[PDB]
Design a binder for this molecule. Structure first.
Ligand SMILES: Cc1cn([C@H]2C[C@H](O)[C@@H](COP(=O)(O)OP(=O)(O)O[C@H]3O[C@H](C)[C@@H](N)[C@H](O)[C@H]3O)O2)c(=O)[nH]c1=O
Ligand SMILES: Cc1cn([C@H]2C[C@H](O)[C@@H](COP(=O)(O)OP(=O)(O)O[C@H]3O[C@H](C)[C@@H](N)[C@H](O)[C@H]3O)O2)c(=O)[nH]c1=O
Ligand SMILES: Nc1nc2c(c(=O)[nH]1)N[C@H](CNc1ccc(C(=O)N[C@@H](CCC(=O)O)C(=O)O)cc1)CN2
Ligand SMILES: Nc1nc2c(c(=O)[nH]1)N[C@H](CNc1ccc(C(=O)N[C@@H](CCC(=O)O)C(=O)O)cc1)CN2
Ligand SMILES: [Cl-]
Lengths: 241, 241
């Protein structure tokens, strides 16, 4: 048997992994799996409801990780320090098509800059969303779709990748390969610049609809303007066939 | 006593007028009120439920209307023929500030063109939304508001104008005044042109957000574009404090 550590702050992916273990005898006869959410998760209830434990991977002593054959990050909210990724096999499930729009909310950037979007399972190195790729697949962006629409496709794709590839990766059956290039990276500040709308901006209606749809994601409060009295107004769009 | 005919295709206004009658001794003691919806109303069920009768005022024979002291239009879907307005006292309750943005959906156009918006009770002549004005009041348009937001304010003000003035008009206690200018009439085709978005249109973000809020009104399917594959996509905006 092997011990496996999954660090996730996404209910859907951890639930999915849990369900694969309970329904697949190869998993349950071979693997022990601990699951933890990150200490910086501000709302972890739904994860605590599944019996997960908190972990702070930035302060976790290397020593306490010796048993683990490997570590999986499924939408972990923390950057793994260099010392962790360089001394333990760490594998990340990322909601973007590396190396395009690495970093924050890839589908928001892809709606705007037209680079590929998708899902990627990859080895972690000390950089973000950077290490060698085990599998990935693209998804499309249609004219009517917002962030949340594409994000939902990506999650479904991540589930597919996990189902078809995760056990092979754990069993050293799958061999990864360098990304074709360095790619591009988008930060939280970049997302924040986009959210601060400029009512004076000159552009096509197309460009403005695309900005609003990239920034439309459920109840998240993203895009805003200030009006002539300095009242803050958030803005989202709805597109329907 | 006086016989009054009310032609309305608007559940709220007709219901309000019926409520004032039921609640105000000055009304029940002085008035008999007949109520009809237009023969062209495609979904009159809610009005039929009030026991209202169908009328086609474009075909109605004038001799059949002799008993009426006056006729009130309250969001009537038909243009009254010259013969009717020139031989019966006809009064319209209009959800715009005449003479600005007369005709269709005044508040849509005011969001776009910044002309005043409001409600008006006026005498009907053979032109639309054009006769002498008994009373009217402006409402304002706030940065976060859509068509439906402003429309709701108009309807409320329509109630206040009725409550305060409609009996005075009926009893010849309030004399109307010419509109300040000829003004501008928007047609249905004008509305439909605005709905056909041009994705290549160049404008400020302001401009584009204003066009989309002018066209956002609950579940009506108004603004659309065609994508690359000629799929029709409807667009609404949400603005929120
Ligand atoms: C927080 C936030 C999120 N979103 C949208 C865009 C995101 O793609 C989507 C999901 O975000 P989420 O953070 O709630 O859920 P996850 O996609 O599970 O994100 C998690 O793993 C990611 C790979 C890390 N970068 C995140 O920090 C971490 O929270 O929601 C917004 O549109 N605005 C926001 O403020
Ligand atoms: C039909 C339609 C309406 N709307 C919005 C804008 C309108 O101000 C609002 C309500 O219009 P309505 O037709 O449902 O309801 P009312 O405001 O009662 O309008 C009625 O009296 C008016 C004086 C006439 N011009 C209309 O034909 C007649 O239906 O809803 C749209 O945004 N799109 C639409 O296609
Ligand atoms: N090692 C390493 N750690 C990783 C990944 C990796 O492939 N390599 N992949 C996943 C990436 N998830 C993220 C990426 C960035 C942040 C993040 O929170 N960035 C902060 C600050 C971090 C910093 O720069 O120090 C910011 O943008 O301000 C959080 C989770 C999880 N951790
Ligand atoms: N007499 C006359 N009739 C009226 C009003 C008026 O103050 N004067 N006031 C109300 C106006 N209601 C309308 C206005 C326009 C239409 C309409 O159907 N317009 C068409 C036709 C336009 C036209 O022929 O002028 C269009 O936009 O293309 C229907 C109900 C009720 N009827
Ligand atoms: Cl004039």
């Amino acid at each position: 048997m092997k011990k496996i550590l999954v660090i996730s702050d996404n209910y859907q992916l951890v639930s999915y992994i849990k369900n694969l273990y309970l329904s697949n005898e190869e998993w349950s006869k071979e693997l022990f799996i601990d699951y933890s959410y990150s200490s910086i998760n501000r709302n972890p209830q739904s994860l605590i409801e599944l019996g997960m434990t908190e972990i702070d991977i930035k302060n976790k002593n290397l020593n306490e990780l010796n048993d683990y054959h490997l570590i999986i990050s499924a939408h972990c909210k923390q950057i793994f320090p260099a010392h962790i990724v360089n001394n333990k096999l760490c594998i990340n499930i990322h909601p973007g098509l590396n190396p395009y729009n690495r970093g924050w909310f890839p589908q928001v950037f892809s709606i705007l800059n037209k680079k590929p979007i998708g899902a990627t399972i990859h080895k972690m190195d000390s950089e973000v969303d950077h290490g060698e790729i085990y599998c990935q697949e693209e998804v499309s962006i249609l004219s009517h779709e917002t962030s949340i629409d594409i994000y939902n496709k990506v999650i479904e794709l991540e589930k597919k990748l996990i189902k078809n590839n995760l056990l092979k990766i754990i069993n050293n059956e799958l061999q990864p390969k360098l990304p074709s290039q360095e790619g591009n990276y988008n930060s939280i500040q970049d997302f924040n610049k986009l959210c601060k709308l400029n009512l004076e901006d000159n552009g096509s209606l197309r460009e403005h609809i695309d900005l609003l749809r990239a920034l439309t994601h459920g109840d998240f409060k993203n895009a805003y303007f200030y009006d002539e009295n300095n009242t803050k107004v958030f803005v989202k769009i709805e597109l329907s066939l």
